[PDB]
Structures are given as C-alpha cells and as structure tokens.
C-alpha cells in the first residue's frame, strides 16, 4: 500500500515540517489530502509523474509539494499555525481512477510551546473479586494519564504475545482540564478474560503505551525530564485469591 | 456529409531498448488534427492542423495528461497480456486501441465503436449497446471481466455518445474554413500506348477532400471490357487525396470509353472521355 | 478530446 | 454537490441504509462510496451509475429520479463501524481529484443478550492505595453522562468481544484523586 | 501474431513537369508490425532529408505512413522507394513513374 513517514509529528508553532509519502510502485499519480477531526479529507495537490498538476485555490503558499523522480513525494508546511494540526493523507492511482489507494496518514499537532508536551504515566488495575464471583469473569483496566499531545499507541501483552480478544481502548481521549485549550489527555483500556485464566499464577499481563513526543533534534532547556518518544509499561500477574 | 471524431493509440514494447513506444493521433473526418509521441523532444499532445493553433494551454495540458495516462497504463497492459499468453520478455509486441463517434448528414449521432487489438488480432471489442464487451480469447475473457465491473459506470457510452459528439461539433466549427469545404477533384484522362493493338486509358481524380470517391469506366458498345485497375486512394501530402482507374482498350476503340466520377464536391457526377 | 482508461486489462 | 446524514445508529446483525442527496447531479456523473475505519485512510467499497450493484462488502441502489442514492450494508458487524462518505462526479473532469463531504459516522452496537448493569472497584497492581471504578455489563440503550465536579474523570462506553466464548459486553471507567465508586449515573 | 506485408505507392503531389518544384511521395500501408524502414532514392543513392506522417492505422489494425521530400523532377533523374520490414525477404524497391 501507500506508506507515510513519519506516522506522528509534533512541531513548535512558527516552525517548518516535512512529511513524506511512498506510493504503490507503478502508480503514476500521487495526491495529498488534509483531514481535520469530524471532517472528510480536503484535496490539497497531486502529481502525474514528477509534474505537479492542479494546486488547490484555498491553499497557503506555506504548503508546497515536491515529487522529484516521480516516485516518493514530500509535503512541506512552513511557519506552522494551530489550524494546520490535522491528518495529512497521501493517495496513489494508475491514471484517473484505477487502484485509487489512501495511505494511513501522518497526524500533525502544532503546540504553542514544547513545555506543554508530557509523556504518559501508565497503571494496570487488577479485577474486582465482586466481579469475579458474580459475572464469572476478570476485567483488567489500563490507564494512561497526563500525556500531551494525543500521540499514544496502547497494546495488551499476555505472556509475551499481543492480544485483541477481550480488548477495548477508548475511541478518543478525554481532557483533564476541558477548558484550557492545550489540556493534558487521559485514556483507559479494558482486557476481560475468564475468571480461571486470571486465577492462574503463571499467567502474565502487561499494558504497553507507545508515546510519540520530542526527538534528539528537539532542543530541551527545562528542569524536568525531556518528554521524549518512549514506551511506558505496567504489569499484573494471576493470583489464586 | 457523414462526419467523425476518431483516436488511434499504438503501444509497442522494446525489451532493454527503453520502455514501450506510445503514439496517439486524432482525426476529424479525414484530417489528422493532433499527435502525441512519448519519444519526440516534447512528450506532449501537439496540434497537427492550423485551426488547433489557438486552443490555449488549458486544452493541451488536459490532452497531454490524458495521453501519459493512456501510455503508462498500456506499458502495464503489455506485461499483463505477455502474462496471459505466456510469451518471453525478449519478444516485442503491439497493443492498439481505437474509438470514434460518427454523425449523419443531419448532425444526428449515428454510431460509437471502441476496440482493442494485441499483436494484430482483434482482442476486446465494445458491443452495439456500448456497455458490454466481446473477448476473442480465453485471455481476453479475463480482461472482459475486469472492464465490465469498472465500466458499469458506462464510461464508453458517456464518451462516444456525448463527449465525443459535443467535441466533434466543436472541432467542425473551428476548422470549417478547411473541413466543411468540399474540394471537387481536378479530373483528366491519359493515354499510354502498349502495342499498336492496345493502349491504357487512366482516369485521374486529383486534389480532392473528403476522401469518398467513385471512379467507374464504361463502354458504349456490346464489346468485352477488360478489368479496371483501381489504385487505393492516397494522400497528396497537403490535405487532399488522389485516385485513378485504368483499362487496357483495343487501339481504335478509345473514344467508346467514358469515365464517371462521384464526389460530394461535384454538383452532379462528371463524365470524361480521352481527347488527344 | 481523447480519454485515458479507468480500468486495466 | 451532495449532503448525507452527519451520523446513523445501528445494531449488530442488521441491514443499514445511508442515503446521499444529489439533486443537481450531472447527466454522466456517477456515485462512488468510501469507508474510513478509525485511524486508517478511506477505502473504495462500491461505485454505481444507474443499475443497482452488489459486491461482498455492500450494495448500492439508485432510483430513476437519480436525485439521491442509498448504500445498503448486509448483516452489519462491529468491525463495519466507520465514516461512510458519498462522492458524486466523474474521473473525466475530476482528474481523480476526489471531493469528500462530512460523510456519515456509522455506529454498530451489540444486542445486549443478558442486561446486568453492575459497578466494581479495581486496585493499582503496584500501589494499592489508588483505584478506578468500572461501570460494566450494561445495556447499549443508555448514555454515560460526563464528569461533574473538578477531578472526577469518566470515559464514554467501549464494546469488547471475547471470541472463543461468544460474549460481547459494554464497559466504561471513572476515577478520582471521599469519592465512592457507588456515585455515577 | 499477425505479420502483413506492406503495400507501396511512389508518386507526386502535382503532375510532373521537368524543372518545376514538386513533392515525391511513398505511401506504405497494410503492414504489421509498425517496425518499418523507408528511404527515397535519387539514382540508387539515399535522399538525406525525408519527412513522414505520424504513425496511424485502420479497421484491420494495419499501419500506414507517408514518407515525402520536395524534389525537382527532370528527364533522366530516377527516383524510387526502398522499403524493408520483417515480412520482406529483402528490401523492396518501387521506381517512381510520373504516369502512375
């Protein structure tokens, strides 16, 4: 399919950014779209080979695409603003219609200052024995709190192996201070398994949270720990209680 | 006065001599008006007719884009076809694609046709109803399937019946100076003795447009009449066509040979006798 | 005007 | 240009009917529907001109008037829960330059087999002083009210599926930083 | 695969008149594939400035080209067309004859 670099980008207001797209090989057309929340993708620009054809009427001259070699393409946003914060979707096709495929996207958040960025703190909470006797089941809950922005990937890991049966992460986060616009986020996740499977002493649980935050490129002059890209994890074991 | 807009696309592979050659040419009636050729200095759709010279860069951009699209898909299509027929990578092979709309005397849409051919033979052929194909082959039957699913949007009917007609009507109004001008043939007879027994009479039509003509020879008497040799109509290289018909007649009898010429540029059919 | 293909073979 | 519903509400195993509205559709414009799952890019599902069409994924019905068409989803699953956008146009003028609306957010919920609205308290594996509240096993036919005071925090619902034990259930989460888990609703 | 032998027609835009400005034509048609060589000869030696038409074809998918140069025809000057194609066992030469 279409592939996008990177899947997550944070950038300070007023600074430049450059996503990249690598289309399905042999597709001679590549399109850039921009999608904000609760909205269909808006068309930005496209190419036939390396030739940048029609360029949207409503497009900032901050925005500007390149497809040298008519293969990969790079969208470049200059002097970033709040509104810019949106999913940048890539698309590739064989002429006007056939094989029309969208990439998964690059999520962009423009923060008014880097200091607003915080990594998540993660806890796994064991099941209630109230629940275990009554419903004959054991609902674990994972909890990532105090991260900004919302660039986190939360998986479950039973005995070294990722799982999707029983799992439920929230659709989008909720805000800790729903008023102040750059609020810090929190997200939950459940893993329900059989009463007997949580009561096995040998059965290991682990709630992983991949963060996406600053990278070595980003200058950090503050007291506290630099809020870098990291994986923050939390575990539980089965007990015969 | 039965008019046409027709396109002719040719794609030819060249294993390890670059990627496939692609050429497009369009025709109003019997006048070529546009070329595209992906080798030649500019890989762009260009005018081949003085009247196309004052379409702006909008028009040419669209047509250039449409051409590179067709080219790049036909590069793929050759590899597919090579696959279905199980032919080596060294063989050069040919994909051809042709379509046109035809109007009657009255400007009433008459027919659409669109057609594909691989290596000379009919490959895939659009039907009367303009929404369904006939495949010659087991392999074509794969391509038949794939072209039905996607052309349930009636893309051919849409083009042929509607877009092709509209644009025909447009090219006719732009070119009319040259195109709707009926150029009657300049017509004369030539005598070429063989023996004292027989000469050849040759009836010439020269410098005519359009290219639909009839050259017939007839004989006053009850005598035999040797087979006429009709040469196939041929471009002057300046817009107009040439044709000739020839008999060998017994010497003496040459004034019993009358040559009739039918052409729309001619008020009524002309009749022409050798006169030395 | 010509038209580019929407399907392939 | 075309309007549809901003959202639509379904139950599992059902058939769902979203209708696009294209009164000024061109004579040769055709109707083509995308399906965008949470996070992933939009995916082509079905295109139609005037004939009714039927693929694995779905079926598109067009009436004569051609002023409105209706994508119809069979035996809708939990997975089949996305935004469904309706485009009206033609490659021929578009250039593959797609124009998307707001689309229609499709929710699919499970038919709650044994309604059993409970509440439970769970202990932080590592520091047992701190906890979270679990509203679970409840009916789909109910809104989960937001938080009230400063530092009460309450999530929307979240359908989970236990495959090798054919049991779908609901669940939500509250926590605070006294405050009994006995108070929500 | 189809291979069709080309059909040749050497000739003149205008009726030939010794000393007067004219155009020599060669009309290769009915052939397949596309791959073709064409020279106009002046007394058995190649003319080195010949134009030609954009490759086209017909109902039957056979190709047709018009090779041409301006010439000045005379009494004794011999013009022909040398065509080669995979289908021709050796280059076919067709002599120009102002009466055909």
Give C6's contacts (C-beta < 8 A, 6+ positions apart).
A95, A96, A97, A98, B150, B151, B153, B155, D91
If asked whether residues D74 and D128 sit together in one domain, one would say: no
Range of the domain at D14: 7-109
B59 belongs to an annotated ligand binding site: no
Give A176's contacts (C-beta < 8 A, 6+ positions apart).
A145, A146, A183, A184, A185, A186, D153
Q: Count CB neighbours of A68 within 10 A.
A: 9
What DSSP line would sit under E37-90, residue for residue?
Answer: EEEEEESSSB-S--EEPPPEE-TT--EEEEEEEEE---SS--EEEEEEETT-SS
Whether A110 and A20 have beta carbons less than 8 Å apart is answered as no
Question: What residues form DSSP beta bridges with D34?
Answer: D44, D85
The CATH number of domain A3-111 is 2.60.40.10: yes
Most C-contacting residue of B11, B24, B55, B70 (CB-CB within 10 A), to test interface? B70
Question: What residues form DSSP beta bridges with A148?
Answer: A118
SS3 for D14-77 is CCEEEEEECCCCCCCCEEEEEEECCCCCCEEEEEECCCCEECCCCEEECCCCCCEEEEEECCCC
If asked whether residues D81 and D140 sit together in one domain, one would say: no
Domains belonging to chain E, first-starting first, are 1-100 (2.60.40.10)
Q: Please state, in angstroms and as integers, the Cα–Cα distance from residue B131 to each residue in A146, B125, D54, following that order.
A: 60, 11, 18
Tokens read off for A33: 């779209």
- Are chains D and E in touch, 3+ Cβ pairs below 8 Å? no
How many Å apart are CA B182 and CA B192, to the nearest integer? 31
| Subunit contact B92:E35, Cβ cutoff 8 A | yes
Tokens read off for B221: 């008497």
User: Is residue A132 classed as helix, strand or coil in its secondary structure?
Assistant: helix
Most D-contacting residue of B132, B153, B163, B166 (CB-CB within 10 A), to test interface? B153
Please check whether residue D185 lies inside any domain of the structure: no
What DSSP line would sit under D71-95, residue for residue?
Answer: EEESS--SSS-SEEEEEEE-HHHHS
Tokens read off for B193: 């003795």
A49 in contact with chain C, both atoms CB, cutoff 8 A:
no
Burial class from Cβ neighbours inside 10 Å (0-12, 13-18, 19+) for residue B78 reads: buried
User: Is residue A68 classed as helix, strand or coil in its secondary structure?
Assistant: helix
Task: Single out the residue of E10, E83, E4 nearest to residue B242, CA to CA.
Answer: E10
Q: Please state, in angstroms and as integers, the Cα–Cα distance from residue D173 to each residue in A142, A213, A221, B197, B256, following that order.
A: 10, 26, 37, 115, 110
Tokens read off for A9: 């980008």
* Residue A107 Cα, gap to closest chain D Cα (Å): 10
Give D168's contacts (C-beta < 8 A, 6+ positions apart).
D12, D78, D110, D113, D159, D160, D161, D162
If asked whether residues D100 and D152 sit together in one domain, one would say: no
Whether E71 and E11 have beta carbons less than 8 Å apart is answered as no
If asked whether residues D49 and D134 sit together in one domain, one would say: no
Say which CATH superfamily domain A115-237 falls into: Immunoglobulins (2.60.40.10)
Nearest residue in A to D96, CA atom: A96
CB pairs under 8 A between B and D: 23
Site of tokens 């929190």: A186
- Are chains B and A in touch, 3+ Cβ pairs below 8 Å? yes
Whether D108 and D76 have beta carbons less than 8 Å apart is answered as yes
How many Å apart are CA D169 and CA D112, to the nearest integer? 7
How many Å apart are CA B244 and CA E99, to the nearest integer? 10
* Residue B73 Cα, gap to closest chain D Cα (Å): 15
Dihedral angle sign, alpha carbons of residues B226, B227, B231, B233 = positive
Q: How is residue A127 annotated by DSSP?
A: P
Q: Domain locations in chain B?
A: 4-179, 186-273
Whether B69 and B85 have beta carbons less than 8 Å apart is answered as no
How many Å apart are CA A206 and CA B69, to the nearest integer? 51
Whether B71 and B95 have beta carbons less than 8 Å apart is answered as no
A95 in contact with chain C, both atoms CB, cutoff 8 A:
yes
If asked whether residues D30 and D81 sit together in one domain, one would say: yes
Chain A residues with CB inside 8 Å of D102's CB? 38-40
| Subunit contact C4:B73, Cβ cutoff 8 A | yes
Tokens read off for A7: 């899947």
How many Å apart are CA A148 and CA E41, to the nearest integer? 81
Q: Please state, in angstroms and as integers, the Cα–Cα distance from residue E20 to each residue in A165, D162, E42, following that order.
A: 92, 95, 16
Question: What residues form DSSP beta bridges with A102?
Answer: A91
If asked whether residues D101 and D129 sit together in one domain, one would say: no
How many Å apart are CA B190 and CA E74, to the nearest integer? 20
Distance of CA B229 to the CA centre of its chain: 23
Q: Please state, in angstroms and as integers, the Cα–Cα distance from residue B57 to each residue in B46, B47, B164, B173, following that order.
A: 10, 12, 20, 20
Whether A157 and A164 have beta carbons less than 8 Å apart is answered as no
* Residue B153 Cα, gap to closest chain D Cα (Å): 5
User: Is residue A134 classed as helix, strand or coil in its secondary structure?
Assistant: helix
| Subunit contact D90:B159, Cβ cutoff 8 A | no
Whether A152 and A209 have beta carbons less than 8 Å apart is answered as yes
Q: Any idea what the CATH number is for the domain that residue D25 is in?
A: 2.60.40.10
How many Å apart are CA B34 and CA B27, to the nearest integer? 7
Please check whether residue D182 lies inside any domain of the structure: no
The set of chains that have 3 or more CB pairs under 8 A with C is A, B
If asked whether residues D88 and D167 sit together in one domain, one would say: no
If asked whether residues D94 and D133 sit together in one domain, one would say: no
* Residue A49 Cα, gap to closest chain B Cα (Å): 9
Asked if the domains A3-111 and A115-237 are classified in one and the same CATH topology, the answer is yes
Long-range contacts of B243-246, Cβ-Cβ distance < 8 Å, separation of 24 or more: B243/B185, B243/B204, B243/B205, B243/B213, B243/B215, B244/B202, B244/B203, B244/B204, B244/B205, B244/B215, B244/E100, B245/B202, B245/B203, B245/B215, B245/B216, B245/B217, B246/B200, B246/B201, B246/B202, B246/B203
If asked whether residues D156 and D89 sit together in one domain, one would say: no
Task: Single out the residue of A25, A111, A34 nearest to residue A70, CA to CA.
Answer: A25
Run of H or E residues at A141? strand A137-147
Q: How many domains does chain D have?
A: 2
B41 in contact with chain A, both atoms CB, cutoff 8 A:
no
Site of tokens 């592979």: B13
How many Å apart are CA D112 and CA B82, to the nearest integer? 56
If asked whether residues D89 and D152 sit together in one domain, one would say: no
If asked whether residues D74 and D145 sit together in one domain, one would say: no
Task: Single out the residue of B222, B221, B217 nearest to residue B244, CA to CA.
Answer: B217
- The CATH topology of domain B4-179 is 3.30.500
Experimental method: X-ray
Whether E98 and E16 have beta carbons less than 8 Å apart is answered as yes
Dihedral angle sign, alpha carbons of residues D80, D85, D88, D91 = negative
Q: Which CATH architecture has domain B186-273?
A: Sandwich (2.60)
- Are chains D and A in touch, 3+ Cβ pairs below 8 Å? yes
């Amino acid at each position: 399919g279409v592939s996008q670099n990177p899947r997550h980008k944070i950038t300070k207001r007023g600074q430049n950014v450059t996503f990249r797209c690598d289309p399905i090989s042999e597709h001679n057309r590549l399109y850039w779209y921009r999608q904000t929340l609760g909205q269909g993708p808006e068309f930005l620009t496209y190419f036939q080979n390396e030739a940048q054809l029609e360029k949207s009427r409503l497009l900032s001259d901050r925005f500007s695409a390149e497809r040298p070699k008519g293969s990969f393409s790079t969208l470049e946003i200059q002097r970033t603003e709040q509104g810019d914060s949106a999913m940048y979707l890539c698309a590739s096709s064989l002429g006007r219609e056939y094989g029309y495929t969208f990439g998964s996207g690059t999520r962009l958040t423009v923060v008014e200052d880097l200091n607003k960025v915080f990594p998540p703190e993660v806890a796994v909470f064991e099941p209630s024995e109230a629940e275990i006797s009554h419903t004959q089941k054991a609902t674990l809950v994972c909890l990532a709190t105090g991260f900004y922005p919302d660039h986190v990937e939360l998986s479950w890991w039973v005995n070294g192996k990722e799982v999707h049966s029983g799992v439920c992460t929230d659709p989008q986060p909720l805000k800790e201070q729903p008023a102040l616009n750059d609020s810090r986020y929190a997200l939950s996740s459940r893993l329900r398994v059989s009463a007997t499977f949580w009561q096995d002493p040998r059965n290991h649980f682990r709630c992983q949270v991949q963060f996406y935050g600053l990278s070595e490129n980003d200058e950090w002059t503050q007291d506290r720990a630099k809020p870098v890209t990291q994986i923050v994890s939390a575990e539980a074991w089965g007990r015969a209680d | 006065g039965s008019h046409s807009l027709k396109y002719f696309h040719t794609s030819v592979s060249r294993p390890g001599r670059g990627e496939p050659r692609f050429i497009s040419v369009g025709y109003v009636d019997d006048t070529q008006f546009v070329r595209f050729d992906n080798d030649a200095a500019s890989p762009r759709m260009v005018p081949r007719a003085p009247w196309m010279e004052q379409e702006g860069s909008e028009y040419w951009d669209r047509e250039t884009r449409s051409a590179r699209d067709t080219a790049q898909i036909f590069r793929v299509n050759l590899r597919t076809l090579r696959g279905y027929y199980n032919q080596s990578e060294a063989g050069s092979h040919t994909l051809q694609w042709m379509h046109g709309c035809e109007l009657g005397p009255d400007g009433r849409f008459l027919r659409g046709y669109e057609q594909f051919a691989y290596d000379g033979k009919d490959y895939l052929t659009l039907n009367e109803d303009l929404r369904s194909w006939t495949a010659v082959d087991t392999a074509a039957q794969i391509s038949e399937q794939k072209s039905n699913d996607a052309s349930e949007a009636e893309h051919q009917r849409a083009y042929l019946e509607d877009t092709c007609v509209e644009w025909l009507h447009k090219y006719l109004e732009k070119g009319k100076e040259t195109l709707l001008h009926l150029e009657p043939p300049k017509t004369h007879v030539t005598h070429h003795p063989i023996s004292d027994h027989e000469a050849t009479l040759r009836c010439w039509a020269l410098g005519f447009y359009p290219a639909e003509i009839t050259l017939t020879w007839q004989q006053d008497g009850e005598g035999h009449t040797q087979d006429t040799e009709l040469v196939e109509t041929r471009p002057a290289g300046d817009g107009t066509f040439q044709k000739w018909a020839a008999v060998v007649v017994p010497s003496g009898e040459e004034q019993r040979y009358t040559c009739h010429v039918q052409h729309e540029g001619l008020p009524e059919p002309v009749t022409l006798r050798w006169k030395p | 005007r010509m038209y580019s293909p929407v399907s392939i073979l | 240009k075309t309007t549809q519903p901003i959202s639509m509400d379904s139950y599992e195993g059902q058939e769902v009917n979203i209708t696009c509205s294209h009164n000024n559709i061109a004579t040769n414009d055709y109707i083509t529907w995308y399906q965008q799952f949470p996070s992933q890019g939009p995916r082509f599902i079905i295109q139609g001109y005037k004939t009714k069409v039927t693929n694995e994924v779905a079926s598109l019905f067009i009436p004569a008037d051609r002023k409105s068409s209706t994508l119809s989803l069979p035996r809708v699953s939990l997975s089949d829960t996305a935004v469904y956008y309706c485009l009206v146009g033609s490659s021929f003028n578009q250039g593959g330059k797609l124009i998307f609306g707001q689309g229609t957010e499709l929710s699919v919920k499970p038919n709650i087999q044994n309604p059993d609205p409970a509440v439970y308290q769970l202990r932080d594996s590592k520091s047992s002083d701190k906890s979270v509240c679990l509203f679970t096993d409840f009916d789909s036919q109910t809104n989960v009210s937001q938080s009230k005071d400063s530092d009460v925090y309450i999530t929307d619902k979240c359908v989970l599926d236990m495959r090798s034990m054919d049991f779908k259930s609901n669940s939500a989460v509250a926590w605070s930083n006294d405050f009994a888990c006995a108070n929500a609703f | 695969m189809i291979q069709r032998t080309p059909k040749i027609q050497v000739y003149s835009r205008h009726p030939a008149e010794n000393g007067k400005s004219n155009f020599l034509n060669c009309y290769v048609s009915g052939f397949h594939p596309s791959d073709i060589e064409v020279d106009l000869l002046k007394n058995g030696e190649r003319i080195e400035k010949v134009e030609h038409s954009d490759l086209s074809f017909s109902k039957d998918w056979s190709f047709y080209l018009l090779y041409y140069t301006e010439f000045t025809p005379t009494e004794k000057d011999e013009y022909a067309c040398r065509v080669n194609h995979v289908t021709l066992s050796q280059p076919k030469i067709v002599k120009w004859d102002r009466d055909m």
